[PDB]
PDB file of C-alpha atoms in Angstrom:
ATOM      1  CA  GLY A   1       1.963 -22.768 -38.196  1.00 29.84           C
ATOM      2  CA  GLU A   2       3.107 -20.501 -35.373  1.00 30.06           C
ATOM      3  CA  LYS A   3       1.991 -16.895 -35.847  1.00 32.91           C
ATOM      4  CA  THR A   4       1.607 -16.215 -32.125  1.00 30.95           C
ATOM      5  CA  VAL A   5       3.518 -16.503 -28.849  1.00 32.97           C
ATOM      6  CA  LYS A   6       2.249 -18.776 -26.077  1.00 29.40           C
ATOM      7  CA  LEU A   7       2.472 -17.961 -22.367  1.00 28.18           C
ATOM      8  CA  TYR A   8       2.840 -20.521 -19.578  1.00 26.47           C
ATOM      9  CA  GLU A   9       2.378 -20.016 -15.837  1.00 27.33           C
ATOM     10  CA  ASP A  10       4.258 -23.117 -14.687  1.00 30.12           C
ATOM     11  CA  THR A  11       7.971 -23.505 -15.417  1.00 30.22           C
ATOM     12  CA  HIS A  12       9.085 -26.014 -18.049  1.00 29.63           C
ATOM     13  CA  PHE A  13       6.034 -24.976 -20.070  1.00 26.02           C
ATOM     14  CA  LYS A  14       3.647 -26.697 -17.662  1.00 21.17           C
ATOM     15  CA  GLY A  15      -0.024 -26.048 -16.965  1.00 25.73           C
ATOM     16  CA  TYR A  16      -2.019 -24.129 -19.563  1.00 23.14           C
ATOM     17  CA  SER A  17      -0.549 -22.059 -22.395  1.00 23.22           C
ATOM     18  CA  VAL A  18      -2.180 -18.898 -23.742  1.00 24.48           C
ATOM     19  CA  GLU A  19      -1.462 -17.379 -27.153  1.00 22.03           C
ATOM     20  CA  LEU A  20      -2.457 -13.945 -28.453  1.00 20.97           C
ATOM     21  CA  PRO A  21      -2.407 -12.155 -31.835  1.00 19.03           C
ATOM     22  CA  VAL A  22       0.162  -9.506 -32.758  1.00 18.16           C
ATOM     23  CA  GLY A  23      -0.360  -6.544 -30.450  1.00 17.10           C
ATOM     24  CA  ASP A  24       0.317  -4.964 -27.065  1.00 15.65           C
ATOM     25  CA  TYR A  25      -1.434  -5.801 -23.795  1.00 12.50           C
ATOM     26  CA  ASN A  26      -1.480  -4.153 -20.367  1.00 11.17           C
ATOM     27  CA  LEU A  27      -1.657  -5.557 -16.835  1.00 10.42           C
ATOM     28  CA  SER A  28      -5.457  -5.486 -16.976  1.00 10.89           C
ATOM     29  CA  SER A  29      -5.333  -7.108 -20.414  1.00 11.75           C
ATOM     30  CA  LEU A  30      -3.239 -10.000 -19.104  1.00  7.77           C
ATOM     31  CA  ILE A  31      -5.975 -11.190 -16.746  1.00  7.79           C
ATOM     32  CA  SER A  32      -8.502 -10.721 -19.550  1.00  6.43           C
ATOM     33  CA  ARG A  33      -7.054 -13.862 -21.132  1.00  7.06           C
ATOM     34  CA  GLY A  34      -6.684 -15.642 -17.805  1.00  8.24           C
ATOM     35  CA  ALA A  35      -3.229 -14.745 -16.513  1.00  6.09           C
ATOM     36  CA  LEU A  36      -2.113 -12.406 -13.728  1.00  5.02           C
ATOM     37  CA  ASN A  37       0.484  -9.767 -14.600  1.00  6.56           C
ATOM     38  CA  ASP A  38       2.627 -11.372 -11.897  1.00  8.86           C
ATOM     39  CA  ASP A  39       2.378 -15.143 -12.335  1.00  6.56           C
ATOM     40  CA  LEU A  40       3.645 -16.129 -15.784  1.00  6.22           C
ATOM     41  CA  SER A  41       6.869 -18.130 -15.522  1.00  5.59           C
ATOM     42  CA  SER A  42       7.088 -19.499 -19.064  1.00  3.67           C
ATOM     43  CA  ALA A  43       6.343 -18.633 -22.691  1.00  4.56           C
ATOM     44  CA  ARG A  44       6.727 -20.348 -26.065  1.00  5.46           C
ATOM     45  CA  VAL A  45       8.027 -18.336 -29.019  1.00  8.33           C
ATOM     46  CA  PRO A  46       9.563 -20.282 -31.933  1.00  2.00           C
ATOM     47  CA  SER A  47      11.421 -18.746 -34.875  1.00  2.00           C
ATOM     48  CA  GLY A  48       9.222 -16.183 -36.601  1.00  2.00           C
ATOM     49  CA  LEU A  49       7.734 -14.660 -33.457  1.00  2.00           C
ATOM     50  CA  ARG A  50       8.938 -11.633 -31.495  1.00  2.00           C
ATOM     51  CA  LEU A  51       7.730 -10.494 -28.071  1.00  2.00           C
ATOM     52  CA  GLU A  52       8.741  -7.901 -25.479  1.00  2.00           C
ATOM     53  CA  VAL A  53       8.087  -8.094 -21.737  1.00  2.00           C
ATOM     54  CA  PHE A  54       7.447  -4.939 -19.712  1.00  2.00           C
ATOM     55  CA  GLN A  55       7.678  -5.416 -15.946  1.00  2.00           C
ATOM     56  CA  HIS A  56       6.662  -1.792 -15.389  1.00  2.00           C
ATOM     57  CA  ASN A  57       3.543  -0.099 -16.759  1.00  2.00           C
ATOM     58  CA  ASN A  58       3.188   2.907 -19.062  1.00  2.00           C
ATOM     59  CA  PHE A  59       6.597   1.920 -20.433  1.00  2.00           C
ATOM     60  CA  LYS A  60       8.446   3.664 -17.603  1.00  2.00           C
ATOM     61  CA  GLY A  61      11.958   2.671 -18.635  1.00  2.00           C
ATOM     62  CA  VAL A  62      13.009  -0.869 -17.752  1.00  2.00           C
ATOM     63  CA  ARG A  63      11.950  -3.134 -20.616  1.00  2.00           C
ATOM     64  CA  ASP A  64      12.721  -6.692 -21.722  1.00  2.00           C
ATOM     65  CA  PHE A  65      12.780  -8.458 -25.090  1.00  2.00           C
ATOM     66  CA  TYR A  66      12.437 -12.163 -25.876  1.00  2.00           C
ATOM     67  CA  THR A  67      12.626 -14.044 -29.176  1.00  2.00           C
ATOM     68  CA  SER A  68      13.068 -17.639 -28.018  1.00  2.00           C
ATOM     69  CA  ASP A  69      11.511 -20.295 -25.785  1.00  2.00           C
ATOM     70  CA  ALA A  70      11.690 -18.728 -22.323  1.00  2.00           C
ATOM     71  CA  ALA A  71      10.942 -20.786 -19.213  1.00  2.00           C
ATOM     72  CA  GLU A  72      11.181 -17.767 -16.911  1.00  2.00           C
ATOM     73  CA  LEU A  73       9.899 -14.239 -17.528  1.00  2.00           C
ATOM     74  CA  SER A  74      12.202 -11.269 -16.946  1.00  2.00           C
ATOM     75  CA  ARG A  75      11.019 -10.431 -13.430  1.00  2.00           C
ATOM     76  CA  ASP A  76       9.619 -13.211 -11.244  1.00  2.00           C
ATOM     77  CA  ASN A  77       5.888 -12.497 -11.032  1.00  2.00           C
ATOM     78  CA  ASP A  78       6.131  -8.939 -12.354  1.00  2.00           C
ATOM     79  CA  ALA A  79       4.937  -8.339 -15.915  1.00  2.00           C
ATOM     80  CA  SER A  80       2.835  -5.180 -16.183  1.00  2.00           C
ATOM     81  CA  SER A  81       2.493  -5.081 -19.970  1.00  2.00           C
ATOM     82  CA  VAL A  82       3.696  -7.328 -22.794  1.00  2.00           C
ATOM     83  CA  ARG A  83       4.164  -7.227 -26.567  1.00  2.00           C
ATOM     84  CA  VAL A  84       3.621  -9.906 -29.213  1.00  2.00           C
ATOM     85  CA  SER A  85       4.309  -9.929 -32.953  1.00  2.00           C
ATOM     86  CA  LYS A  86       5.475 -12.071 -35.872  1.00  2.00           C
ATOM     87  CA  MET A  87       9.094 -11.633 -36.957  1.00  2.00           C
ATOM     88  CA  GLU A  88       8.913 -13.490 -40.273  1.00  2.00           C
ATOM     89  CA  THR A  89       5.667 -15.420 -39.812  1.00  2.00           C
ATOM     90  CA  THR A  90       5.548 -19.183 -40.349  1.00  2.00           C
ATOM     91  CA  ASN A  91       4.209 -21.503 -43.049  1.00  2.00           C
TER      92      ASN A  91
END
């Protein structure tokens, strides 16, 4: 089913989507998959998936949390680190 959250660069879930397993990734980790820390503008996350966006790095203070289909990250082109996990999984 859907045990991972997808990430889109183009609004309206356009372009290419990238999904990752439960875990935390940094700015350098974002590009590792093929996405700049400051470029993502969309992300798919159906019921059963929980993710948290972190504009700043090292978890300074300002943090964001998303648990639904988002067609626009917290800060426009500014996502240092991110978090992905499964709320209640999916069959």
